[PDB]
Amino acid sequence: AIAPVITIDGPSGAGKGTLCKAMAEALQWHLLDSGAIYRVLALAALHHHVDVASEDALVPLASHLDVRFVSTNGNLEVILEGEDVSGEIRTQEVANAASQVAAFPRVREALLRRQRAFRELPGLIADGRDMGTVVFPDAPVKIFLDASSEERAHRRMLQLQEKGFSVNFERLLAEIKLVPAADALVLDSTTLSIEQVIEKALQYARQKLALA
Numbered sequence: 069a070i071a072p073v074i075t076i077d078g079p080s081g082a083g084k085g086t087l088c089k090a091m092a093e094a095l096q097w098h099l100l101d102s103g104a105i106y107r108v109l110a111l112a113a114l115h116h117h118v119d120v121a122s123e124d125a126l127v128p129l130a131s132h133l134d135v136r137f138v139s140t141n142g143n144l145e146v147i148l149e150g151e152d153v154s155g156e157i158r159t160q161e162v163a164n165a166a167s168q169v170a171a172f173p174r175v176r177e178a179l180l181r182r183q184r185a186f187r188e189l190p191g192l193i194a195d196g197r198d199m200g201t202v203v204f205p206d207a208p209v210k211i212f213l214d215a216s217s218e219e220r221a222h223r224r225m226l227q228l229q230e231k232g233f234s235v236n237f238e239r240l241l242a243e244i245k246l247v248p249a250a251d252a253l254v255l256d257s258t259t260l261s262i263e264q265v266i267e268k269a270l271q272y273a274r275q276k277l278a279l280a
Contacts, residue, residue, distance in 0.1 A: 069206055072191040072277055075199035076269075078213035079246060081220030081227075083257045083265065087213060088195040089139040090266045091273070095193070099137040100186040101144070102196030102203070105179060107157045108135050108148050110165035115148075120165050123172040130178035158231065200249035209276050211269055212248035215257035220244050 074091065076084050085101070092099040109130050110120070118125045138145040146154045156162060169175055183203055186192055194203065200210035215223075221241040228235055248254060253272050255265050 069187075071187050071189045072209070073187050073204045073207040074191070074193050074209040074211065074273055075204050075207045075249075075252075076193065076195040076211050076213060077197055077199050077201070077246070077248065077252070079215070079220060081223035081244070082213045082215040083219075083223065083262055084195045084213050085144070086142070086262060087211075087266055087269060088193050089142050089144060091269060092139050092193045093142075094266075094270060095191060095273075097191035097193055098186060098188060099139055100183060100192060100194040101137050101146075102183060102194065102199060104137070104146055104157060105133075105135070105183060106166040106170050107162050108146060108153070109133060109175075109179065110169050111153055111156055111162050112148060113169065114162070114165060120168050123174050126169060126172065126175045127178045130175055130182055133179075133182050197246050200252055201247060205249070209273050210249045210252040211272070212252040212254050213257055213265070214254065217241060217245050219258045 076088050078084050088099065088101070091097075109126070112118070112129055112133060113120055113126065116129070118129050120126075134149045136147050138147065144154060145152050146157055180203065183194070186194070187204070196203070200207055200212070218241065221237060221244050224240050224244065225235060225237055253269075255268060257265055260268065
């Protein structure tokens with residue numbers, strides 16, 4: 069501890085990514101995207117020819133993972149060993165290798181330690197599913213972002229469109245149809261606009277970490 073950490077947990081498509089980036093840029097703090105972490109490990113393995121099925125080989129790789137996340141104008145750059153790999157990480161191939169890598173207990177443990185090492189001054193914004201419950205249970209500010217099925221389905225639709233696939237909203241609404249920390253601030257992405265969620269998250273963080 070010592071360096072402040074703001075955790076953002078919630079289901080897929082709730083807007084965590086957007087909130088996380090906006091907060092990291094507003095406060096100019098470090099950023100950690102746990103969801104992308106496994107894909108980056110998987111890509112490093114493929115790049116270095118580390119056997120995706122060998123737990124023993126994957127652990128050292130995970131423990132020394134050279135990754136950093138940078139957000140500019142809401143655009144996320146994933147720098148693995150000096151090069152931006154944001155595009156590579158979005159492929160199904162990497163997504164599949166990420167599932168293989170994530171299956172091993174010792175690999176998940178090593179990645180747990182590696183994620184905790186992102187906590188440095190002036191601060192860290194971290195988003196995922198268990199950031200405030202498992203990774204940083206002592207985080208001074210914890211936020212749980214919830215959203216309606218429609219909001220989540222719409223966000224998913226736009227995310228796929230980007231990869232080139234345009235899919236029926238009704239189909240996705242069906243496709244989509246995680247415990248908040250006891251000390252988390254609960255924010256609903258559907259009662260408030262995303263701009264309002266960011267405002268309210270920043271105000272809460274300020275009352276807890278600064279102001280006066």
